[PDB]
PDB file of C-alpha atoms in Angstrom:
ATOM      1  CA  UNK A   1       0.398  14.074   7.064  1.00 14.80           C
ATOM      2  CA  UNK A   2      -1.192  14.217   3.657  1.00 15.62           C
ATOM      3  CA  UNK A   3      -3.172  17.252   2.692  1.00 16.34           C
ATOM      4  CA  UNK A   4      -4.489  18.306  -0.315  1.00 14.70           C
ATOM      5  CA  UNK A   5      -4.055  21.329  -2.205  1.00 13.53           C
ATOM      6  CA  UNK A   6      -7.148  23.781  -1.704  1.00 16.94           C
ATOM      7  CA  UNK A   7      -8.144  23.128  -5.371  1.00 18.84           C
ATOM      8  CA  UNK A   8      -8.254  19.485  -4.909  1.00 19.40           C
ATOM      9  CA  UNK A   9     -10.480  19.092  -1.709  1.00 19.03           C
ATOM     10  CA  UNK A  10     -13.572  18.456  -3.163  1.00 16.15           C
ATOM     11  CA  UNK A  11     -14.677  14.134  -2.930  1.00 17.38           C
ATOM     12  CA  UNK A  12     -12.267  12.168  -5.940  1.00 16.67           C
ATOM     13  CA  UNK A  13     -16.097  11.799  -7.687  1.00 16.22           C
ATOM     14  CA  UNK A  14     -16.290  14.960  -8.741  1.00 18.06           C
ATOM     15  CA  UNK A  15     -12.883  15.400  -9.999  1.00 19.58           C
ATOM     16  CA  UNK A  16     -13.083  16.656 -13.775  1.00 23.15           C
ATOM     17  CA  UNK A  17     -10.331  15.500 -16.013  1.00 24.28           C
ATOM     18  CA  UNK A  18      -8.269  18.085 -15.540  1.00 24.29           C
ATOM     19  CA  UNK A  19      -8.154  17.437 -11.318  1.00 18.70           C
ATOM     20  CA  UNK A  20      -6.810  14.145 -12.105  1.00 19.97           C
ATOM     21  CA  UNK A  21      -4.375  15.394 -13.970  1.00 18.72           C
ATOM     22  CA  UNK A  22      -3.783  17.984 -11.134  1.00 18.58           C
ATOM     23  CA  UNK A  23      -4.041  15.343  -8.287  1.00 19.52           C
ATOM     24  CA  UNK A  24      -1.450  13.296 -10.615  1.00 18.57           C
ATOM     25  CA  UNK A  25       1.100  16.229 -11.097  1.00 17.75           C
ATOM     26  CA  UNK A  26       0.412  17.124  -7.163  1.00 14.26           C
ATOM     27  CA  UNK A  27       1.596  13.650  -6.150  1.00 13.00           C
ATOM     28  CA  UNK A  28       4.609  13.374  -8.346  1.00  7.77           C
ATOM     29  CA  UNK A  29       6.228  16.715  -6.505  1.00  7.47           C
ATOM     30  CA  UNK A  30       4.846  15.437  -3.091  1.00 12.19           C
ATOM     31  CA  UNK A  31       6.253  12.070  -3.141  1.00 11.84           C
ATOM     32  CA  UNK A  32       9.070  12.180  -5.253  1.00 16.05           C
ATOM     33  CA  UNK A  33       7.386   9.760  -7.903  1.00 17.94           C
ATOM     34  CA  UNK A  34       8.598   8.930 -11.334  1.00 18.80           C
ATOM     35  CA  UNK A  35       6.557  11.228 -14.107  1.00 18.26           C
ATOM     36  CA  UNK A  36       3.957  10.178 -15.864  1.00 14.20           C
ATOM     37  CA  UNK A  37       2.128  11.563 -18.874  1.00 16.66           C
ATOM     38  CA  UNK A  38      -0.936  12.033 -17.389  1.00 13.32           C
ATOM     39  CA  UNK A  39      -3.210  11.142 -20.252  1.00 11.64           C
ATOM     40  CA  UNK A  40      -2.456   7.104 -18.696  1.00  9.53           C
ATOM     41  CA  UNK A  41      -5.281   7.849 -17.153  1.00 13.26           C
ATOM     42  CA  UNK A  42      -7.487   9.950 -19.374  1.00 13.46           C
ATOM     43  CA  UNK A  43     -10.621  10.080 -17.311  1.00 15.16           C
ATOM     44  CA  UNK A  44     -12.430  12.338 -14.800  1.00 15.92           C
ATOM     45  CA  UNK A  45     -12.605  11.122 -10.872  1.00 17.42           C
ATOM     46  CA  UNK A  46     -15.834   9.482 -10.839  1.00 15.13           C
ATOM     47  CA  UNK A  47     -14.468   7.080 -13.636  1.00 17.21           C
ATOM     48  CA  UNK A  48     -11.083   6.704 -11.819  1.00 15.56           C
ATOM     49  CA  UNK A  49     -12.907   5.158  -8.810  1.00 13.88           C
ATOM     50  CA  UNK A  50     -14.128   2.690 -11.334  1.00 14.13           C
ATOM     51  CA  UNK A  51     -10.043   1.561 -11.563  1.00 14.86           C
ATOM     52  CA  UNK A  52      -8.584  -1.649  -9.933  1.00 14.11           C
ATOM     53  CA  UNK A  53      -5.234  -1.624  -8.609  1.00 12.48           C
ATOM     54  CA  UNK A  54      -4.183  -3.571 -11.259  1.00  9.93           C
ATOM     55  CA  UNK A  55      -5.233  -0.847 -13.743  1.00  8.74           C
ATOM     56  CA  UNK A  56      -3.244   1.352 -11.824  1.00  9.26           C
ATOM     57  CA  UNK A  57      -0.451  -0.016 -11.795  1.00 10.42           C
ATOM     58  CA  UNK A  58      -0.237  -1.141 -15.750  1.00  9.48           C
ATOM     59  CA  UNK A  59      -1.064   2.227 -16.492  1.00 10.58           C
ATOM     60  CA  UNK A  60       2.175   3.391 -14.083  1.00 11.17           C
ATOM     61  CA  UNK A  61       4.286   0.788 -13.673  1.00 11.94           C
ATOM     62  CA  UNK A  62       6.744   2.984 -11.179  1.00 10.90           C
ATOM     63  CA  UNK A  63       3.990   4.566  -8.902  1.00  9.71           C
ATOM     64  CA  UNK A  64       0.685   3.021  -9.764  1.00  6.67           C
ATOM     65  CA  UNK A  65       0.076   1.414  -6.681  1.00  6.18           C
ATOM     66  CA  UNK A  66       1.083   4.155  -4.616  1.00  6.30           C
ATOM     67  CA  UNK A  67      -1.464   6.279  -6.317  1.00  8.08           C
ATOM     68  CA  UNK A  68      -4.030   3.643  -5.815  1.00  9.98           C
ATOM     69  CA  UNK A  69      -3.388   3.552  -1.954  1.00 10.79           C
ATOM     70  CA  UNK A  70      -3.161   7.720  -2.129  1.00 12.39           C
ATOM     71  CA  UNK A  71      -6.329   7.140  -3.680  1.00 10.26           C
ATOM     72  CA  UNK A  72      -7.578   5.377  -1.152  1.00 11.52           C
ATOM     73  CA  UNK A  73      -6.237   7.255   1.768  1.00  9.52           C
ATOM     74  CA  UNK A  74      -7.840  10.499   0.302  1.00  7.74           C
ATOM     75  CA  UNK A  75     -11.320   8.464   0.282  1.00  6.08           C
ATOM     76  CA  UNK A  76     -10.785   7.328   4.224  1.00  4.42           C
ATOM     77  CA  UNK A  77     -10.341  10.751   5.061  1.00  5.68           C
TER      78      UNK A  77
ATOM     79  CA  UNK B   1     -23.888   6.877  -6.606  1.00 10.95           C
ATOM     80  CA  UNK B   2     -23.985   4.933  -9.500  1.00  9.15           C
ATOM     81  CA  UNK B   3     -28.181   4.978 -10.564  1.00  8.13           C
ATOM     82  CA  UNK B   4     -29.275   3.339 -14.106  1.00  9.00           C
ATOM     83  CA  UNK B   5     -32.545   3.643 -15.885  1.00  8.50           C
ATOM     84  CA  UNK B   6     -35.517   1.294 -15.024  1.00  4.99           C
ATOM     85  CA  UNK B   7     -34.929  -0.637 -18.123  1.00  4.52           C
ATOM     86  CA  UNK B   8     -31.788  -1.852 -17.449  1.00  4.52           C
ATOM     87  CA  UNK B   9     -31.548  -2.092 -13.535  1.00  5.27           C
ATOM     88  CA  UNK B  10     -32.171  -5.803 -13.912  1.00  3.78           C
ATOM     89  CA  UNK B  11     -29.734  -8.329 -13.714  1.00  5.44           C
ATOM     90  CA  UNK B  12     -27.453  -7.995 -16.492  1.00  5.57           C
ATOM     91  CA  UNK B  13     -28.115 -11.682 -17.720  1.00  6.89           C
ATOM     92  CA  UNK B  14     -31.317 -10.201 -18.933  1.00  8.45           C
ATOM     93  CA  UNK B  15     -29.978  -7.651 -21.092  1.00  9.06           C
ATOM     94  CA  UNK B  16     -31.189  -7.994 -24.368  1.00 12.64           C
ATOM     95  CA  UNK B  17     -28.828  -7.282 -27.031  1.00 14.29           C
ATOM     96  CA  UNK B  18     -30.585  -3.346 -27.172  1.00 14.30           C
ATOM     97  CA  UNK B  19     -30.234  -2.947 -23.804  1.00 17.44           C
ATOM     98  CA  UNK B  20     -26.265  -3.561 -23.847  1.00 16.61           C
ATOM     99  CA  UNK B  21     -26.470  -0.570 -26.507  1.00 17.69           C
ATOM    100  CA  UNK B  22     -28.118   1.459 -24.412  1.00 18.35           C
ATOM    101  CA  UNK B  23     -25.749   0.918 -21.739  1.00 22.45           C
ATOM    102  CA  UNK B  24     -22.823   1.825 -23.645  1.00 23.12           C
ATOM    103  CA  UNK B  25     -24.978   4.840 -24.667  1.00 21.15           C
ATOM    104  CA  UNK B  26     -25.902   5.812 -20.534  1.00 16.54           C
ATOM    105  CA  UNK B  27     -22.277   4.827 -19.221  1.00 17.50           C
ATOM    106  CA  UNK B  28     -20.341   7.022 -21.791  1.00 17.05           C
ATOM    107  CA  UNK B  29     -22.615  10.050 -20.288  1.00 14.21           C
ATOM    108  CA  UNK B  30     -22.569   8.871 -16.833  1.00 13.41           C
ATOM    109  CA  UNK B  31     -18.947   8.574 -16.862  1.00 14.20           C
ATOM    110  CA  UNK B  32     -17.958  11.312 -19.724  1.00 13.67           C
ATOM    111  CA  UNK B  33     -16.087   8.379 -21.683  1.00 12.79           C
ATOM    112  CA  UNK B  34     -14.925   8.998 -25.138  1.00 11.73           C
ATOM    113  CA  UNK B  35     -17.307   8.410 -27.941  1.00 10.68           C
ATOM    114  CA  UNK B  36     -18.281   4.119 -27.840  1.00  6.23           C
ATOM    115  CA  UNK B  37     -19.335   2.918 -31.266  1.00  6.70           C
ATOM    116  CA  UNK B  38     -22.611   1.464 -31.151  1.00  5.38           C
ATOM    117  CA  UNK B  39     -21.302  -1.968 -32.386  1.00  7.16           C
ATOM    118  CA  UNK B  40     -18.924  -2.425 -29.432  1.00  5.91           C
ATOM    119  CA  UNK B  41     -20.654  -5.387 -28.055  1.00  4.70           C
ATOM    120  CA  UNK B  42     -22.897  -6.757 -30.407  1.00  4.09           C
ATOM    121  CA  UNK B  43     -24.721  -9.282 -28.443  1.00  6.13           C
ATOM    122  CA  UNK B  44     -27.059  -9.623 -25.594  1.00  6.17           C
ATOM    123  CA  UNK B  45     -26.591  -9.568 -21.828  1.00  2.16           C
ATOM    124  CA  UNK B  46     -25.694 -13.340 -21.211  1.00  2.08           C
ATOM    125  CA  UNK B  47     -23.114 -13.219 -23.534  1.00  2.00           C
ATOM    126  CA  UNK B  48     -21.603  -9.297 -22.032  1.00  2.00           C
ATOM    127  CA  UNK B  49     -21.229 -11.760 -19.116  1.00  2.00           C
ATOM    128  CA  UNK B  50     -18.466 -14.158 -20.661  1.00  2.00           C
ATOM    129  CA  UNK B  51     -16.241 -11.724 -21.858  1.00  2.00           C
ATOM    130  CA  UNK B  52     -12.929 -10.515 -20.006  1.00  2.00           C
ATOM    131  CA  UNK B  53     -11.229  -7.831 -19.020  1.00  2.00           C
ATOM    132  CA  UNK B  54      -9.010  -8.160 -22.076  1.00  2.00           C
ATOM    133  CA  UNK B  55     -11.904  -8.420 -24.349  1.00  2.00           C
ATOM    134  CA  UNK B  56     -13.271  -5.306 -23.539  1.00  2.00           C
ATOM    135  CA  UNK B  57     -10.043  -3.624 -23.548  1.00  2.00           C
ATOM    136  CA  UNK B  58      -9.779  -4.809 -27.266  1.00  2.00           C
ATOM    137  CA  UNK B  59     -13.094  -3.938 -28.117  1.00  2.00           C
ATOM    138  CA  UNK B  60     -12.777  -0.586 -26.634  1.00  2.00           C
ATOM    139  CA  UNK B  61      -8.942   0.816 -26.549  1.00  2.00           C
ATOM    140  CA  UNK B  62     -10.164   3.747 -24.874  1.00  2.00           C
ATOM    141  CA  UNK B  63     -13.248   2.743 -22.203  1.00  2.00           C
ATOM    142  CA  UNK B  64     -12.488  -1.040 -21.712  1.00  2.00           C
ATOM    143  CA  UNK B  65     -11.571  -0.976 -17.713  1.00  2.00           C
ATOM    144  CA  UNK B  66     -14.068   2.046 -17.158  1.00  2.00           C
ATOM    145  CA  UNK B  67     -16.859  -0.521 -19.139  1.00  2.00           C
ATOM    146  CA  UNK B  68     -15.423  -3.464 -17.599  1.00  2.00           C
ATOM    147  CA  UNK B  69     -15.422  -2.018 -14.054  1.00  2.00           C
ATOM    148  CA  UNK B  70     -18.900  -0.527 -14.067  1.00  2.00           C
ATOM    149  CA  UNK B  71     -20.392  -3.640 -15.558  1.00  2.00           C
ATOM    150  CA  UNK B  72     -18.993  -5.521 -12.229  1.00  2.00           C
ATOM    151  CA  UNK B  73     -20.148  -2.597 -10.095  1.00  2.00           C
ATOM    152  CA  UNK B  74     -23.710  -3.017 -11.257  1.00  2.00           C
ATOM    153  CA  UNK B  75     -23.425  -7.237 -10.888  1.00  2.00           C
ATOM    154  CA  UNK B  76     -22.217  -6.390  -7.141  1.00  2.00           C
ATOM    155  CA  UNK B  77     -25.110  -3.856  -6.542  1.00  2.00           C
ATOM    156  CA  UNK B  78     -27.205  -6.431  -8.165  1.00  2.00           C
ATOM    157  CA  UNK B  79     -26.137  -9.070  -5.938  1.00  2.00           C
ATOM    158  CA  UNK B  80     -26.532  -6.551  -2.830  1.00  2.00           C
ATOM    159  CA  UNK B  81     -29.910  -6.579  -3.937  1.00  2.00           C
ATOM    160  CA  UNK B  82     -30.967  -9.899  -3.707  1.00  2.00           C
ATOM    161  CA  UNK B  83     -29.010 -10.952  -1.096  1.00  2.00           C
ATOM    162  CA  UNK B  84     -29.249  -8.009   1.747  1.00  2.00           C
ATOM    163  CA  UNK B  85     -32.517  -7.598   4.320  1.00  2.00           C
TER     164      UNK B  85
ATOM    165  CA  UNK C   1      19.520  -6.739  16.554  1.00  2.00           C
ATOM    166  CA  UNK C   2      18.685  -4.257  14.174  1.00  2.00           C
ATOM    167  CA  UNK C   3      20.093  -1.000  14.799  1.00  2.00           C
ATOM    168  CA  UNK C   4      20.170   1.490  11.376  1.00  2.00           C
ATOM    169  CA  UNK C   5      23.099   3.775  10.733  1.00  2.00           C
ATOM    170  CA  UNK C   6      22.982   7.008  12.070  1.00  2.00           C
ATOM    171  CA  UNK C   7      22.103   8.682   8.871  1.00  2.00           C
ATOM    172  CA  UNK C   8      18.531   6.702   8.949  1.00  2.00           C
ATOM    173  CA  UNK C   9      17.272   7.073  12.301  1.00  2.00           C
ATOM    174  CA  UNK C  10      15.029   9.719  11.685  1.00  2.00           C
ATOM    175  CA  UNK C  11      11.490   8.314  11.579  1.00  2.00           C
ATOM    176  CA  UNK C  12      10.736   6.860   8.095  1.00  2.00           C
ATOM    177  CA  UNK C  13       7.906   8.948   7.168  1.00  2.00           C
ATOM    178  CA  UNK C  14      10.315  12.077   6.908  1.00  2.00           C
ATOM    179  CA  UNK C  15      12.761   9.895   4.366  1.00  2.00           C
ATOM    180  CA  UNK C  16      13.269  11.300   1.345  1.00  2.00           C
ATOM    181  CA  UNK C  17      13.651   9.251  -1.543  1.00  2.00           C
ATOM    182  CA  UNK C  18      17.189   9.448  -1.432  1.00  2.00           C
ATOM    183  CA  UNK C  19      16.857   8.219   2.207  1.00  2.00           C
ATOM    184  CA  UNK C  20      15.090   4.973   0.882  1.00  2.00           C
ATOM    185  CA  UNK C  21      17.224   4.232  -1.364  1.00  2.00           C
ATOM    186  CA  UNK C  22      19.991   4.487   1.282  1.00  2.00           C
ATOM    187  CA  UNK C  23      17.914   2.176   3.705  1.00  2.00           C
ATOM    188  CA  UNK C  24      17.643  -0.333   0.545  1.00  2.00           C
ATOM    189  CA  UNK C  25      21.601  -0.307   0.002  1.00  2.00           C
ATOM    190  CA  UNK C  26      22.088  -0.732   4.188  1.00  2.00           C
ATOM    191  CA  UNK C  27      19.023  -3.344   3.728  1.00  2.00           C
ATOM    192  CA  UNK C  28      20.704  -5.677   1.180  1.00  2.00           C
ATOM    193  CA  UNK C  29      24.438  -5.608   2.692  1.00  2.00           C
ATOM    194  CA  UNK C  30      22.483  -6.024   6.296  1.00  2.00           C
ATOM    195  CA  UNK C  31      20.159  -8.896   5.104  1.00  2.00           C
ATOM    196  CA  UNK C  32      22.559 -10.565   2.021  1.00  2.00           C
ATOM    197  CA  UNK C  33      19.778 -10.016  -0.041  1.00  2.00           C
ATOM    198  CA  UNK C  34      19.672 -10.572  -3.726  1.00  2.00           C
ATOM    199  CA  UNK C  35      21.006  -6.981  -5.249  1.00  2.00           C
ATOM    200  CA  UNK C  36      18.085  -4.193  -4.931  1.00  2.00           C
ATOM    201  CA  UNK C  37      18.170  -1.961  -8.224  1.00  2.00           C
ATOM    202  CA  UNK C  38      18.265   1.655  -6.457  1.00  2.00           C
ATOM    203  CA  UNK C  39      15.370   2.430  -8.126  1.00  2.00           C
ATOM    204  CA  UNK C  40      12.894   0.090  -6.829  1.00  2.00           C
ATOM    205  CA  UNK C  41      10.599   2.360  -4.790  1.00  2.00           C
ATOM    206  CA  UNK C  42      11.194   5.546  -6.618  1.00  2.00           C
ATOM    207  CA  UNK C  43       9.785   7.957  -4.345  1.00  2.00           C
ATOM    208  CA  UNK C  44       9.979   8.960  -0.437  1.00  2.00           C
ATOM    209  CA  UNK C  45       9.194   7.486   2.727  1.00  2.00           C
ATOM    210  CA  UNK C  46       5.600   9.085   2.948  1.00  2.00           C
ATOM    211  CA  UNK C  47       4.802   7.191   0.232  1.00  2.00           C
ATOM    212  CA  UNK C  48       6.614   3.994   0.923  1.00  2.00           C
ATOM    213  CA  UNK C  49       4.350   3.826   3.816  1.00  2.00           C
ATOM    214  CA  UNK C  50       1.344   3.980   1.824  1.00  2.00           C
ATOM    215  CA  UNK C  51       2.266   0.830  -0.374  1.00  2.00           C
ATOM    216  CA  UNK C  52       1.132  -3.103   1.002  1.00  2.00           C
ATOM    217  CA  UNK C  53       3.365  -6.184   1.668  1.00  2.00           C
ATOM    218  CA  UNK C  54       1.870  -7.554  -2.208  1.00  2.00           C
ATOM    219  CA  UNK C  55       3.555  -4.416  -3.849  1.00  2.00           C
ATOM    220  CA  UNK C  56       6.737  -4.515  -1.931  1.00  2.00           C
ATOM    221  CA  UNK C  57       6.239  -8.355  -3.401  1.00  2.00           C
ATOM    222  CA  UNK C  58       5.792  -7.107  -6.783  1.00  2.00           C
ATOM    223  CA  UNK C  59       8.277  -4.586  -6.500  1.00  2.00           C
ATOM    224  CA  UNK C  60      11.227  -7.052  -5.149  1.00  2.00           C
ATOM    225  CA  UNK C  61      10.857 -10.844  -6.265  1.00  2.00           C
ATOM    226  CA  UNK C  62      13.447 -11.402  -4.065  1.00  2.00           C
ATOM    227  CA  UNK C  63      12.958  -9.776  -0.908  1.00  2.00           C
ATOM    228  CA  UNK C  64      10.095  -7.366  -1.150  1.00  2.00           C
ATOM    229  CA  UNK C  65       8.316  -9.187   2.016  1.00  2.00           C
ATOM    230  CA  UNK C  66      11.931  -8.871   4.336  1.00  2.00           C
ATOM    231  CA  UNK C  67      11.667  -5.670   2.991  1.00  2.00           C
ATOM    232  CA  UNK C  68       8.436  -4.670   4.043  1.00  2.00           C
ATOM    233  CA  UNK C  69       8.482  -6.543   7.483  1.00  2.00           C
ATOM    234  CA  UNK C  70      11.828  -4.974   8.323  1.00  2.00           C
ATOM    235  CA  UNK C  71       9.986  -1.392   7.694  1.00  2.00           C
ATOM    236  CA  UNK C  72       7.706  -3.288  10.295  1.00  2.00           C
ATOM    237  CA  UNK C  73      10.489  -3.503  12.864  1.00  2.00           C
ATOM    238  CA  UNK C  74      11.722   0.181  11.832  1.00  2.00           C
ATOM    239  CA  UNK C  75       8.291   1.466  12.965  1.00  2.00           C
ATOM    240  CA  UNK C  76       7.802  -0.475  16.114  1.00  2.00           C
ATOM    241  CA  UNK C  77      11.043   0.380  17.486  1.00  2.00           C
TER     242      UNK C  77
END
């Protein structure tokens, strides 16, 4: 399954900058992904759902679209 | 969700040229974007429209999906508005 | 058939990235696929299960959709 740490529960809009850069570092260690310098995507969560998949991925080209699909996952939930 | 002022919930091809400004001015708050020059876009509504993707990212290196994104957020909740019961 | 080697029975959503890289080196000796760079899905099987058919497209030129639909058959079996 895929759950969140505690700090991260709250809906993806509200995440500040620094929770993206959280959720990012949390997904690297929990699904092995590449790492990233998280300023790729220097924005908070409410502008992050503003993203394409596309932006995603040119912004990681080794694990944007997973964390697009994360993403998305952690909305349907 | 995403709310914009009176004056500029109409149809983005009746943005006047001030009304793209102010825009900019509400989306950097709304969205906490980095500081957006007021001569980004210098040109009304109609012509925001004809732009791409890659012109806004070269216009603005650090807001041009966020901008580009939102501005076809608000044409879909624009077109939700006409076209829904 | 299609009948993995012992080592990648377990289901795919406990693979860990090593594991998928395993299943891609099985994969293109199984298949005579094109040669699959080890590092094409750099992460684990929880997250390879996130990704779509277009990114294992992206991803593999040459046999990102076998790929994906074999993962198919993996999960169905």
């Amino acid at each position: 399954s895929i759950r969140l740490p505690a700090h991260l529960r709250l809906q993806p809009i509200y995440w500040s900058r620094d929770d993206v850069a959280q959720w990012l570092k949390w997904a690297e260690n929990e699904f092995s992904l590449r790492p990233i310098d998280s300023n790729t995507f220097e924005m908070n969560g409410k502008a992050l759902l503003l993203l394409t998949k596309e932006d995603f991925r040119y912004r990681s080209p080794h694990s944007g679209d997973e964390l697009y699909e994360l993403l998305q996952h952690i909305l349907k939930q």
